[PDB]
Design a protein around this ligand. Structure first.
Ligand code: NAG
Ligand code: NAG
Ligand code: NAG
Ligand code: NAG
Ligand code: NAG
Ligand code: NAG
Ligand code: NAG
Ligand code: NAG
Lengths: 598, 480
């Protein structure tokens, strides 16, 4: 494949404030297309709150990608004067994370803020309810969504819900929200489309439930400490176009985690598959796309902490991701693939997001990040390629950071999100975040060109006696050499430059007498720049080649090998996005042919 | 033949190619046209072709035991003798074995659990309000353990460590739970703490009673299960605790489950555990910065310290720690009484159950080498088809004899030998096997660099002909 690892095009963040903890695309393939980055521990504007954090939009599209801050809420009016009392005024909002889970689709964006803390009306507490800030229609108005902030707020109720720890916008506009610590730590999934939250918002009620609201019911005390909602995603697991929700339960089923899928218009248990090792953190990162090329999406569950005893027998810390393949019956069976890791402490599977058809063969890629993989344990992001039978174990590109080793881990791949095209050339671009020290990488996907070159000789045999050609008035035996080139590639400029190198009798040792030479150039090698129209018919160049005099060489038995090599022109200008096209890995850059002597 | 397919130039890629592959110092059978490959072939093929027996070089590995100690068998009880002594349980301690690629080198080792081996015990219990009925009696039987465990060994030291939950935001605050228990009049019931050790490993039995009578409790936290960080800091650093290099134990007194790495992310904690001791003034300090150990980061640093952890679980949450038992090698789980009044017999039976079990482990194997395991344990139970690194059901002083075969493979570590240690978990003494491979024939030691036969110095003449330098080919490196 190809994703241009040599030109990272990095962003940057403020010092001492973690950056790129959540990175997402905004208005992809359209005007003002930008990249959103979350910095939960960064400093905000309000003096009252420390480590408030804010997400920064970045107007991507220029060579310098410096960017400012967007202002969700720089206020203190809402928090203060609960029931109008200066004494015991507020439980301070400081240290609240604000960029742990940010996401956006269309023009409406959500910035969930876990670890939000608030004092209930009844009695002073330290309840981590958690809120998500919603802004719609080009930042015209801001909305506040804390569905776990209700009257019955207690550590055994919804007080420690911490809603916002995992969210994603469904394609229909629904906001799907996950609260890991709801109902004495069994978890709760909260979903309600934009219409109800827009209509049912009232600021002065600190407690304002959304009318249309879909939540998981309270479970019995036997399901304590399950953490439902640690990671949630949307898919198409139901046969209908209706999008189903998938959520992983990390510590459910007596520490053997399991992942659930839920019915569309009403929250229900549906299908749900369990982990295979205790304390594996099944469901740390769930994902769902059509990784099979059949139209029905596939699950993807990663378990960062896991066993794999080896020839030595020493246990290691290698995570494996699990592929679950949907079927026309709609039910996911036992695992169908497993892409394990190969690093000592790399939490393989900590992040799992899809890419849509990077090779544009109809098969969608995936990207898995190992925050501590690779040498110097700096972090690695793999890209396994989609295939007819599923993903391939060979991870294609293995992307590594370009910086130097530091005392603190740089947490490469701790947050990523690909999918929708950013540059706009019909080729998706990937993003990664490295919250170690202020490092967010936005990558680019290069165009692919499939090229074919055909070499022909007429006649295939040199006749020493038939000196049909004349060299400076001297009759010489000659045969015709013709080569044709055909190239085709999507989203590529209509004219593509190739470098074509022709070599004669190339297998002769350095210093050996080349038996065949070019008639025009009297040499053994020819280089030429060719411009081939994209998708057009093959361009052919015909040339005549001549054999030297019999006195100049003794070898009439070994055939005269002719080699045809080609690769992209290195001097070709980059595209509008600064990318250089790549030759397909199946393209045979070297074609060899031979002519004999009668 | 594969050795013929190896296309050997030097003795190296003929030794590395295969076990039976061999050279010929005469090199008169070899035809001038045929390349350097044709020399390297099987032993029988060489004698068929007429190469002389001394002219073939096929060194075979062997085992040599440099360090051997007479195992302790001194009489006691029946006859008068001096009791105190030092330790010796494994007879071969340091031995040298030279290896060939594909040679299954084999040796034997023997071990018996020495009687009267001093031990160290450590109590790690959660000072949670669910242990109010257990702390009341546990302090009483500190000296009772001193008296009861006198059968095991002449002397042993025992210390105390306490922990409850963590100071992270999500896991620290309580429900209303209107109890308001007047615990003490001295206001010593301080806030919950990540970890704290009060008494180190000491022989004085009175010290337990004296220093644990002043141990308080933590008040009714909601689902507090923060123990793995404590059992990490205990095992990772032992100089401060005083951890002595004998058969050592650790008691984990628990209620209702535990946490594992990736939970602090709820509380805004992302960095993994360092694996470095952080104990300033006998109390865990670097708690809020680092996350919990994974269940397996615990396994590596528990095994690299020979720590034997004992589990004091209460009836409800037994299955979870039962599966923990199969996860963590060399650990035991025990059903504790409701009032914690059976911890003495629990510890006795748990030590008895651990003692019969000896498990072996190696460290950092080189790439090529692989090790298989067979064990001859007790009378019977000789099984090796199911891999045998364990034996049990042994009595005190019984004999066992494991066998180790080290099978080499394609080996590029020509840096002489590599050191690897085989240690039964729980015992300090280990067998370390200096493991040297053969990457050169003996005739190569006498090779002449820039030899005249090598087209006037264009190669090294060794073992009957010339190894050509870079950029030179031919029988005598005559060509560039
Ligand atoms: C019942 C029993 O222990 N059988 C074992 C077998 C083993 O293959 C053999 C090795 O010599 O030793 C025997 O004692
Ligand atoms: C601003 O936020 C940064 C986050 O890295 C923090 O280090 C700094 O102390 C904060 N400063 C103030 C004045 O709050
Ligand atoms: C929406 O906000 C951003 C701010 O620059 C930008 O895309 C644009 O100016 C706004 N929309 C319109 C229609 O102006
Ligand atoms: C819980 O998970 C285990 C896998 O370790 C499985 O064997 C068991 O059947 C599960 N329990 C239920 C009730 O499904
Ligand atoms: C699954 O979702 C549908 C909406 O498409 C809803 O009627 C119900 O919850 C489920 N359908 C059934 C049970 O037929
Ligand atoms: C798993 O799915 C079944 C239905 O398929 C559901 O009834 C059950 O509650 C789920 N597991 C748990 C632990 O809830
Ligand atoms: C105990 O043995 C270990 C070997 O693992 C050694 O490092 C340590 O110094 C020894 N301690 C004493 C007191 O002999
Ligand atoms: C044991 O604990 C129970 C609480 O379940 C208590 O009622 C009982 O009095 C305790 N017994 C002793 C001897 O401490």
């Amino acid at each position: 494949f190809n994703l241009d690892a040599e030109a990272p095009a990095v962003l940057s963040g403020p010092p001492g404030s973690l950056f790129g903890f959540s990175v997402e695309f905004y208005r992809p393939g359209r005007d003002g297309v930008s990249v959103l980055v979350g910095a939960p521990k960064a400093n905000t504007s309000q003096p009252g709150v420390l480590q408030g954090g804010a997400v920064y939009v970045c107007p991507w599209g220029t060579s310098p990608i410096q960017c400012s801050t967007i202002q969700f809420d720089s206020k203190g009016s809402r928090i203060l004067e609960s029931s109008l009392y200066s004494e015991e005024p507020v439980e301070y909002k400081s240290l609240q994370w604000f960029g742990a889970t940010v996401r956006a689709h269309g023009s409406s964006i959500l910035a969930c803020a876990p670890l939000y803390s608030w004092r209930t009306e009844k009695d002073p507490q330290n309840d981590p309810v958690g809120t998500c800030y919603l802004s719609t229609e080009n930042f015209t108005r801001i909305l506040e969504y804390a569905p776990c902030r209700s009257d019955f707020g207690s550590a055994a109720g919804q007080g420690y819900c911490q809603g916002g720890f995992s969210a994603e916008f469904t394609k229909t506009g629904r906001v799907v929200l996950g609260g890991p610590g709801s109902y004495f730590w069994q978890g709760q999934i909260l979903s309600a489309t934009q219409e109800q939250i827009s209509e049912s918002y009232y600021p002065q009620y600190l407690i304002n439930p959304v009318q249309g609201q879909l939540q998981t019911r309270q479970a019995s005390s036997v399901y304590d400490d399950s953490y439902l909602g640690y990671s949630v995603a949307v898919g198409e697991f139901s046969g209908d176009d209706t999008e189903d929700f998938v959520a992983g339960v990390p510590k459910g089923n007596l520490t053997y985690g399991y992942v659930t899928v839920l019915n569309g218009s009403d929250i229900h248990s549906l299908y749900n598959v369990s982990g295979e090792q205790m304390a594996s953190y099944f469901g740390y990162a769930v994902a769902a796309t059509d990784t099979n090329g059949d139209g029905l999406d596939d699950l993807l569950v990663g378990a960062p902490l896991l066993m794999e005893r080896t020839a030595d027998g020493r246990p290691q810390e290698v995570g494996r991701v699990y592929i679950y393949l949907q079927h026309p019956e709609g039910i996911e069976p036992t695992p169908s693939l497993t892409l394990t890791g190969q690093d000592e402490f790399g939490r393989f599977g900590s992040s799992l997001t899809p890419l849509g058809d990077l090779d544009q063969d109809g098969y969608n890629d995936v990207a898995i990040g190992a925050p501590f993989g690779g040498e110097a344990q700096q972090g690695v992001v793999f890209i396994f390629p989609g295939g007819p039978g599923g993903l391939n174990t060979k991870p294609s590109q293995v992307l590594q950071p370009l910086w130097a080793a530091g005392h603190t881990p740089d947490f490469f791949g701790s947050a990523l999100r690909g999918g929708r095209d950013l540059d706009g050339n019909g080729y998706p671009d990937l993003i990664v975040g490295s919250f170690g020290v202020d490092k967010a990488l936005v990558y680019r996907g290069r165009p692919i060109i499939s090229a074919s070159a055909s070499l022909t000789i007429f006649p295939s045999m040199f006749n020493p006696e038939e000196r049909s050609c004349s060299l400076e008035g001297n009759p010489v035996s000659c045969i015709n050499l013709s080569f044709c080139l055909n190239a085709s590639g999507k989203h590529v400029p209509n004219s593509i430059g190739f470098e074509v190198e022709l070599q004669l009798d190339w297998q002769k040792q350095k210093g050996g007498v080349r038996r065949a030479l070019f008639l025009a150039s009297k040499q053994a090698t020819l280089t030429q720049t060719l411009l081939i129209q994209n998708g057009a018919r093959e361009d052919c160049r015909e040339m005549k080649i001549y054999l030297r005099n019999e006195s100049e060489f003794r070898d009439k038995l070994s055939p005269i090998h002719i080699a045809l090599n080609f690769s992209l022109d290195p001097k070709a200008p980059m595209d509008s996005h600064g990318l250089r096209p790549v030759l397909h890995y199946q393209s045979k850059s070297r074609i060899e042919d031979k002519a004999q002597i009668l | 033949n594969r050795c013929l397919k190896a296309n050997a130039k030097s003795c190296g890629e003929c030794i590395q190619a295969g076990p039976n592959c061999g050279w010929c110092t005469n090199t008169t059978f070899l035809q001038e046209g045929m390349p350097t490959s044709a020399r390297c072939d099987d032993l029988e093929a060489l004698k068929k072709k007429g190469c002389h027996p001394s002219d073939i070089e096929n060194p075979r590995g062997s085992q040599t035991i440099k360090k051997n100690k007479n195992v302790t068998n001194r009489s006691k009880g029946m006859a008068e003798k001096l009791r105190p002594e030092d330790i010796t349980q494994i007879q071969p301690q340091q031995l040298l074995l030279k290896l060939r690629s594909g040679e299954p080198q084999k040796f034997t080792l023997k071990f018996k659990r020495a009687e009267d081996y001093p031990i160290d015990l450590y109590y790690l219990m959660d000072l949670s309000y669910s242990m109010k009925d257990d702390l009341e009696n546990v302090k009483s039987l500190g000296t009772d353990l001193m008296n009861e465990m006198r059968r095991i060994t002449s002397d042993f030291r025992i210390g105390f460590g306490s922990f409850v939950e963590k100071t992270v935001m999500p896991y620290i605050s309580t429900t209303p739970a209107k109890l308001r228990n007047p615990c003490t009049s001295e206001q010593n019931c301080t806030s919950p703490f990540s970890y704290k050790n009060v008494l180190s490993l000491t022989d004085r039995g009175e010290f337990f009673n004296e220093l644990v009578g002043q141990q308080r409790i933590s008040g009714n936290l909601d689902s507090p299960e923060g123990g793995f960080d404590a059992i990490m800091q205990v095992a990772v650093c032992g100089s401060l605790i005083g951890w002595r290099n004998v058969t050592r134990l650790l008691v984990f007194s628990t209620d209702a489950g535990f946490h594992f790495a990736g939970d602090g992310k709820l509380g805004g904690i992302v960095l993994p555990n360092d694996g470095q001791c952080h104990l300033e003034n006998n109390v865990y300090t670097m708690s809020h910065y680092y996350d919990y150990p994974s269940a397996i980061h615990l396994v590596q640093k528990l095994s690299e310290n020979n720590i034997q952890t004992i589990f004091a679980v209460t009836e409800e949450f037994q299955p979870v720690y039962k599966e923990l038992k199969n996860l963590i090698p060399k650990s035991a789980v025990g059903t504790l009484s409701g009032n914690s009044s059976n911890v003495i017999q629990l510890i006795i039976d748990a030590y008895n159950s651990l003692s019969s079990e000896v498990i072996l482990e190696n460290s950092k194997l080189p790439d090529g080498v692989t090790i298989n395991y067979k064990s001859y344990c007790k009378n019977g139970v000789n099984g090796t088809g199911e891999n045998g690194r364990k034996c049990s059901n042994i009595s005190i002083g019984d004999e066992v004899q494991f066998e180790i075969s080290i099978t080499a493979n394609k080996c590029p570590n020509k840096e002489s030998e590599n050191q690897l240690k085989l240690n039964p978990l729980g015992f300090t003494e280990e067998v370390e096997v200096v493991l040297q491979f053969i990457c050169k024939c003996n005739c190569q030691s006498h090779g002449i660099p820039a030899s005249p036969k090598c087209h006037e110095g264009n190669g090294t003449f060794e073992c009957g002909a010339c190894r050509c330098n870079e950029g030179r080919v031919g029988r005598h490196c005559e060509c560039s």
